Specification:
Layout: E1 2-5, H1 8-11, E2 19-24, E3 32-35, E4 40-41, E5 47-48
Antiparallel strand pairs: 1-2, 2-3, 4-5
PDB class: growth factor
Keywords: growth factor
Assembly: monomeric
């Protein structure tokens, strides 16, 4: 059940720099485990979540 890195065809399974791995054992089809970047959510780590005070867009948090 080791975390082997997803092949290129599968590495896109987790986006936004999501480090896609697969639980290598002869039972599951290809169950994924993605070490996603800090501040993402969803199965594919598609939706960003508050890293900063991601609401005060007026505040100089962006730039």
């Amino acid at each position: 059940s080791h975390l082997v890195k997803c092949a290129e065809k599968e590495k896109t399974f987790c986006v936004n720099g999501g480090e896609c791995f697969m639980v290598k054992d002869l039972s599951n089809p290809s169950r994924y485990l993605c070490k996603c970047q800090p501040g993402f959510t969803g199965a594919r780590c598609t939706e960003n979540v508050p890293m900063k005070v991601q609401n005060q867009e007026k505040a100089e948090e962006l730039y």
